[PDB]
Design a protein around this nucleic acid. Structure first.
Lengths: 93, 106, 79, 97, 81, 97, 93, 108
DNA sequence: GAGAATCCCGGTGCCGAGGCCGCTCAATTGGTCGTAGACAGCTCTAGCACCGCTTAAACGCACGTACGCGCTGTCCCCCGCGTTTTAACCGCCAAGGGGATTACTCCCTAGTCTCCAGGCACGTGTCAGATATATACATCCTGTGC
DNA sequence: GCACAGGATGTATATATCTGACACGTGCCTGGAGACTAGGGAGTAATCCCCTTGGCGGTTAAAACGCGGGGGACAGCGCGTACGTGCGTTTAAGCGGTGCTAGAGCTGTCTACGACCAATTGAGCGGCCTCGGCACCGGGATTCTC
């Protein structure tokens, strides 16, 4: 029993494209892609949390990390939508 | 009720929070951090599948092949710059020809 | 004869995939030497993973981690 | 009694190769080479099937990336032919030592 | 605006080239190399200032800059302690 | 009087600079450069002096490595004189854009 | 209160070259070198132990980390001196 | 009952307790074995000893006494194993390598 | 002007990518508490700004010389193609050998209190450049005559 | 036009002074070591089943080979030109000095956010099933090309 993001990336696609199909090896491309990006951003977050002698993981250091590892117009767009998501999560407490 | 619903997102804040919990990064992890992480992965996945779907619609194909993934990831210079050290399984090369590699004149 | 397994039309195929018009004839053996030093690195990088995992067969995931360690990471084979 | 120009059929097979994306090394001799270099380290190493494909896609990817840069090196020298000094030029400028 | 990119003077690019072991330097290379200096400069200092603004400091210390060199694989010694 | 052949004193100052250790740029134009190129990201941003020295030795190491690589690129091209296309070729082969 | 490796590396060069001074900029080079080598080998051993699904860092995966990271001839010298160090440690009789 | 540390019990001069302390709250794993700090102490001792042998030999070739970072740069970069180990590093106040390509000389 | 070589369209299965039910862990909910981070306060380090004089260094102009570069005939060694052979490719049997998976048990290592000495931070005694006299002695510059 | 004598001058080498940059003896404090406890993680072992390597054999695109030719590397050679050399003329870092002053950092104190434990339910993973998107085979229009 192993875990992946099959139904979730498929629901994202069927939200944006109700007609395009996905090969399973293409989906393995996307899975290795998404957890690769996850591992980079989480490792940078771990470093920059330890760098400022902080023992806790929070939103501000992954914020700084996603500005610094994502460059232009995928930095500011991701920051904007993620701030929207965390505000709509905190408002819906 | 699922916390992905109360954040309005379709990637698993519980599962990525659990993976971050044994992710072995610090002794404590905040609540909004997997929410923000889920949001940035959701936006980035949405953009890469948007480019892949547009590349699929350009070449009359309704199934995603990794050739179409390579055409989607390498045409955009930003994603080319972020994926500069990464190669794609069964990807291929963008057709690029230097101007004097074409023979003759006019 | 086992050493020369990568044949001359295969270097031709890789070169025209690279998009090169004219090929000098002294390329091919040194390109073979380039292969036998490049994949040398990842065989060393993967069999150590295999023996530390108490296994004597390799798989996709550990050599993908070897490629990730040496900077030319690959997708689609797990990882 | 027709003979084609050097540069017609060659350029058209570069185009036909660039539209295609299939593997170019024959898989069985490459399988022989990776086994015969692996047995120098640990005898009786079994091999998973897609690991050979992963190694193959890595080595076509790296040789294509090397050949494009060496073509750039050769065309920078006002030449249409690559050469082994252009190979070592690309390897030094890649920083591959 | 000011003599700030061109404040790195014309014999200085020459001296840096002679540190590498060149002989002949063309005259039109100086503004291009100044462009090279500046284009390396913003994408090291943007990492430096993101590390700075996370610390809630509005002075840039010597530690976050050398970890910003550590970011892209251009790690540096001496100011790490 | 008696002069020297051109290039004979060039190698003399080559070995003088490569024998040397100290830094070959004045600190103040660098400092104004980083102040006027860093103010766009954030205003009134003060600086540690040894951070400026770190920026110094990092960028001078990048420039001497790039100039050495560009010298190799130029000498591969049957020349000693270094041109714009040598810089473009070198920046294409180290990978950065 | 500050942390370094100054006295230890100091007696390292005194035990083989006693008529040799050391500079504090050079000593900062040395401290940054040993810290960088430590963090590289420790994070790669940690990532390698995460491959195994092993939650414990033992000596076997860090000597594996030596063989991955350190170049081969000094790697085998390093593992030789490491084995005599841990066997001299294990001889608590 | 009075006993000394485990550094000399391992016969080593780097602090095994300090590097163990950095192994706990470096959060690389939640569980650390006993042989890991003594082994890491040993390998850091070996690399540091090799570095100071090369630095001392460079300083005696320059017949100095105090290790200038020029000595460290020539100790690292004139040995090939350290060149692959420390390829992407820059050493402060280190300078560059004395090398002349053979075409640049006046061959006449 | 011909002709292989491309794109484009019609007929063949087919086999690998979407639906569909079971349900098992694993996301989600509620209560506790201790601690690490958030805000206030105070100090001192050191970062910025400017005065003023220095001078090594840079800018600018004239020259001139080795090298960058355009052309030109020369191989001559790379490229297009028939022909064979030959080793790669595919279908499929097998078997056994190695990863996977559960379970139990030890032992090995996290967590806590005590302490004391290891390793600092911070003073002083101890060797290398620089200035200076001094005085005879060898060596060089300079005035002079045959 | 050349040899001889008088004056100047480095200079060598021994002390004295005299400053400037180093290794070594005490407070101190805090973190490493030792003893105890506890619990869960890895080690081992036994079985299961999956897959992986040979092993045929047919067959088939593909490589080795050589032959004719032709475009491209290449040494040379002229020609100009573009950067190295040099020196007058600013000049602007630089040092150091001072004056100020704001922010880094350390402590204190609170409190609020989340680790942790007991309980819950749901939803995604996976075997099974369906079927239609598309590679493939054959025929026709069309494109650079000599």
């Amino acid at each position: 029993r192993k875990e992946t993001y099959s139904s979730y990336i498929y629901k994202v696609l069927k939200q944006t494209h109700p007609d395009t199909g996905i090969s399973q090896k293409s989906m393995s491309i996307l899975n290795s892609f998404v957890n690769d990006i996850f591992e980079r951003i989480a490792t940078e977050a771990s470093k920059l949390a330890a760098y400022n002698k902080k023992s806790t993981i929070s939103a501000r250091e992954i914020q700084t990390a996603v500005r610094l590892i994502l460059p232009g117009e995928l930095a500011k767009h991701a920051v904007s939508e993620g701030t929207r998501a965390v505000t709509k999560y905190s408002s819906s407490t | 009720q699922s916390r992905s619903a109360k954040a309005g997102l379709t990637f698993p804040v519980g599962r990525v929070h659990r993976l971050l919990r044994r992710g072995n990064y610090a002794q404590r992890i905040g609540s909004g951090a997997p929410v923000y992480l889920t949001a940035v992965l959701e936006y980035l996945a949405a953009e890469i599948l948007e480019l892949a779907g547009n590349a699929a619609r350009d070449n009359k194909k309704t199934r995603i092949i990794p050739r179409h993934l390579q055409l989607a990831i390498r045409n955009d210079d930003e994603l080319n710059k972020l994926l500069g050290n990464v190669t794609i399984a069964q990807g291929g090369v963008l057709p690029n020809i230097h101007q004097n590699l074409l023979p003759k004149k006019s | 004869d086992n050493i020369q397994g990568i044949t001359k039309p295969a270097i031709r195929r890789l070169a025209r995939r690279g998009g090169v018009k004219r090929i000098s004839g002294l390329i091919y053996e040194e390109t073979r030497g380039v292969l036998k030093v490049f994949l040398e690195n990842v065989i060393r990088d993967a069999v150590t993973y295999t023996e530390h995992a108490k296994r004597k067969t390799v798989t996709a995931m550990d050599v993908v981690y070897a490629l990730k360690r040496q900077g030319r990471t690959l997708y689609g084979f797990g990882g | 009694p027709h003979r084609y120009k050097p540069g017609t059929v060659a350029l058209r097979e570069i185009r036909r190769f660039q539209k295609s994306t299939e593997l170019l090394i024959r898989k069985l001799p490459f399988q022989r080479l990776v086994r015969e270099i692996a047995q120098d380290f640990k005898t009786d190493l079994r091999f998973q099937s897609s690991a050979i494909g992963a190694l193959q896609e890595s080595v076509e990817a790296y040789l294509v990336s090397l050949f494009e840069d060496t073509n750039l090196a050769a065309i920078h020298a006002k030449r249409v032919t690559i050469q082994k000094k252009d190979i070592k030029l690309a390897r030094r400028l890649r920083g591959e030592r």
